[PDB]
RNA sequence: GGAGGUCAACAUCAAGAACUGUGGGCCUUUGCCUAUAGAACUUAUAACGAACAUGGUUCUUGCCUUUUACCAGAAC
């Protein structure tokens, strides 16, 4: 099988953060959790993210991120 | 048929009009994890129900209908499920034939598709107990009357009626003048847990009467699960009901039994 | 560093986000990097709290 | 400051327009062959 | 099925495609 | 190992019909609503195009104990609840054989190791005021029988049935352990 | 690459003007379904996505439609766009493949996301779905893909 | 068929200065001697990274009321 992964506009995931953004429905007692798990992952993302500073030169650089 | 087989069902409320979430000031700041107020206790909260169910006027058909489910839409027996026929969820009241197809499951699970508990709950709370059956309503806090005093008990046991009654079958209703609460008892295990849900937080009497104006701020009729009835009279009457039921069930098992020989 | 090697594992081979990239639940996408920056705020502020 | 919770991208930054960045002003006589190239984001994805 | 069934039959949808609702 | 190696206990009946089905593992998944400890749980839909997703709600140490399907929480052979069929068993012989489970927390969930079995197991307005009232009747039944030859309020305290109609047009009707008076002013 | 505008990106090739427009009426769209409008239900929120994956689907229709069926525009015009973002190669490259020539997205084609098996019902044709709504009787049950709201996404239907 | 991919999976990467296969002869399968073929990648101011972090245990010290947190050398 394996097709590779899909990638789709930011605009789906502008959304989901700005509306997980709100937080107090019950719908999210899953998310929560899940919250609580990348709390191990962060410093990981924290390094993926500051090693691509984009350097005096380049004025606005654009990446590739992986999201939950 | 012409009632709830006929027209498609209705939303109540829409979406915006929906309740604010973040239940507000029991205390000073408002904690994110569980959904609470943080410092400081008062007075418990709890409010009457600014909505109620319409028994044939909102209930039609929907989708789940359609598409074949069980469970009943709960917040349809609040009657405020703002998704109208797109619910999957049924809107309406309990026949007794879905019970006919809910009775396989309803040793584990509601009419809404929960998982019953085993040992009911302190106060005898919100959902039921597999270990038994239990048809039988406790109602309390009947002062969701507000405290107008209604000229007869039996203004009381009018008003009851006149709501539970809806509802489903019955078998009776006792009110007690002695102790304030009104015992209810129904057929179905399933018509039970469905008005339980409903009934919770109301306030009374007419599209308006009296106070009506200011029914809102009641604190809204307890209805809790019930214990036995400790009398011999009903618990006699109780042993002798199971026992002509077993008499029934003896045939089933001599039946594919006595096929298997 | 120099007089003190660390000589690294052979089978490091199976990364984090390999691993995580595969499931369900992750997404993929492109995006300026400030605005990564902030999401980065939103989310570990969310998760402290 | 702390009190000033931080302002979205899709609204106050995305609009703004960039302000440009160092560069330096080369030549088109010494360094005439990298003057193309040279600050590109990534230099070349493409030079086949 | 026959193609002249399934071209004439498609329209009844209410949007165009593949967002558009048959019924 | 072991928690897998006792296998799902299912019915054969409320399993559904359908020919192949699919069903998940999930190896730590809820304790039991009954000794409140972990174990494996199994969903899956009874056929494939269903909107509702059985699940298994208890131990199989605990449905071995009282003999039941997991899902089901039926009789394993009987398709019973446990208070009837230890109820039936508990008839003939004469008096026996309830099983008597566990309040407190750690009190069930230790008495869910000992392999004992048990009992269950062991073995496998016009008013009308109508009197003469019945004590064991509903009224479902009252109304019902009104309903199947062709509206209520009744008090089972003072054997009194009161009953009020929609029309007198079923006043004929109705007439057309009964103490009839058409009673109205 | 960047949407945004900077100096790095190459300047516009020509006939970009007559569509301009176009294009700008999706985009302003793409803001306006973004905003935040809140709601209670899971049901909902994920609505509010189907918006814009439907845009995004829609923008790229056009542009493609105009490249390779009509070829009303210019390879540098379109391959400028591309590099904009202001439309997906990739799901192009399918729709110039034989079957799949109406499709949803990308998740909608994924064999190994799904729980078993593949491709959301999304995929498959009315023409059949209806064939177990005869047998079974229960008419159909489907109607919103949870990823897209797609209703019948292949190229038949 | 060609080119490509900030795509995937499965192998292998530190040693007698060092790999593998095959033929013939001997002991009796390993192994030894001999003949023969092919050998990506990595190595001599020695090595996968003309780069450079953290942890554990065990010792020697330095801070020095004690534990985290530590000071700077070594071995595994
Ligand atoms: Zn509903
Ligand atoms: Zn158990
Ligand atoms: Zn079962
Ligand atoms: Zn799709
Ligand atoms: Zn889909
Ligand atoms: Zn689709």
Known sequence: ?68 | ?261 | ?49 | ?48 | ?23 | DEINEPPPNICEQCLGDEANIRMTKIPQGSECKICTLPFTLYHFKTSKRSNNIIKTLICVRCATQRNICQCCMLDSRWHIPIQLRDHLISLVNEENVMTEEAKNDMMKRFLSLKNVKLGGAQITTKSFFLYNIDASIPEWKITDTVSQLLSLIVNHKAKCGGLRFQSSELGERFVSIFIIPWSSG | ?157
């Open chain 5, 1 to 23: 099925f026959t193609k002249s069934e399934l071209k004439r039959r498609r329209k009844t949808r209410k949007g165009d495609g593949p967002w558009g609702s048959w019924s």
């Open chain 3, 1 to 49: 560093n120099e007089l003190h090697p660390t000589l690294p594992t052979n089978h490091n081979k199976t990364k984090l986000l390999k691993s995580l990239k595969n499931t369900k639940y992750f997404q993929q996408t492109t995006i300026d990097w400030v605005e990564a920056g902030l999401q980065l705020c939103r989310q570990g502020h969310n998760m402290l709290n």
């Open chain 4, 1 to 48: 400051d702390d009190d000033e919770p931080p302002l979205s991208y899709e609204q106050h930054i995305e609009n703004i327009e960039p302000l440009d960045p160092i560069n330096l002003p080369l030549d088109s006589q010494d360094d005439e062959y990298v003057k193309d190239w040279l600050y590109d984001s990534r230099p070349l994805e493409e030079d086949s």
């Open chain 2, 1 to 261: 048929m012409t009632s709830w087989r006929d027209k498609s069902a209705k939303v109540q409320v829409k979406e915006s009009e929906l309740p604010s979430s973040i239940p507000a000031q029991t205390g000073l700041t408002f904690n994110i994890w569980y959904n609470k107020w943080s410092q400081g206790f008062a007075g418990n909260t709890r409010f009457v129900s600014p909505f109620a169910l319409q028994p044939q006027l909102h209930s039609g058909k929907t989708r789940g209908d359609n598409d074949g489910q069980l469970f009943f839409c709960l917040f349809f027996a609040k009657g405020m499920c703002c998704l109208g026929p797109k619910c999957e969820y049924l809107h309406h009241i309990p026949d007794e034939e879905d019970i006919g197809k809910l009775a396989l499951r309803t040793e584990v699970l509601d009419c809404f598709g929960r998982e019953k508990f085993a040992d009911y709950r302190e106060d005898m709370g919100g959902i039921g107990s597999f270990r038994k059956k239990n048809k039988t309503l406790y109602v309390g806090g009947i002062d969701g009357a507000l405290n107008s005093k209604h000229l007869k008990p039996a203004q009381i046991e009018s008003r009851i009626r006149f709501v539970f009654s809806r509802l489903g079958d019955i078998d009776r209703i006792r009110y007690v003048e002695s102790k304030n609460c009104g015992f209810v008892k129904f057929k179905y295990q399933a018509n039970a847990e469905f008005a339980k849900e409903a009934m919770s937080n109301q306030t009374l009497l007419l599209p308006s009467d009296k106070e009506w104006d200011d029914r809102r701020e009641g604190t809204g009729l307890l209805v809790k699960w019930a214990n036995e009835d400790p009398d011999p009279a009903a618990q006699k009457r109780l042993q002798e009901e199971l026992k002509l039921e077993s008499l029934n069930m003896m045939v089933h098992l001599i039946n594919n039994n006595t096929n298997s020989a």
């Open chain 1, 1 to 68: 099988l394996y097709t590779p992964k899909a990638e789709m506009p930011p605009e789906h995931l502008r959304k989901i953060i700005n509306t997980h953004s709100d937080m107090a429905s019950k719908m999210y007692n899953t998310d929560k959790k899940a919250f609580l798990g990348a709390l191990k992952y962060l410093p990981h993302a924290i390094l993926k993210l500051l090693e691509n500073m984009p350097h005096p030169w380049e004025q606005a650089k654009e990446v590739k991120v992986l999201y939950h």
């Open chain 7, 1 to 157: 690459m960047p949407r945004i505008k900077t100096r790095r990106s190459k300047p516009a090739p020509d006939g970009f003007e007559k569509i301009k427009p176009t294009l700008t009426d999706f985009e302003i769209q793409l803001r306006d379904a973004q905003k935040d409008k809140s709601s209670k239900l899971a049901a909902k929120s994920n609505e509010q996505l189907w918006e814009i994956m439907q845009l995004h689907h829609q923008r790229s229709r056009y542009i493609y439609t105009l490249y390779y069926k009509r070829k009303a525009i210019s390879k540098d015009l379109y391959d400028w766009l591309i590099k904009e973002k202001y439309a997906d190669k990739l799901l192009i490259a399918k729709w110039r493949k034989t079957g799949y020539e109406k499709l949803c997205c990308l998740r909608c084609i994924q064999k190994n996301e799904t729980n078993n098996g593949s491709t959301c019902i999304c995929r498959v044709p009315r023409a059949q779905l209806e064939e177990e709504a005869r047998k079974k009787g229960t008419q159909v049950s489907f109607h919103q893909c949870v990823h897209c709201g797609c209703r019948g996404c292949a190229s038949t239907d």
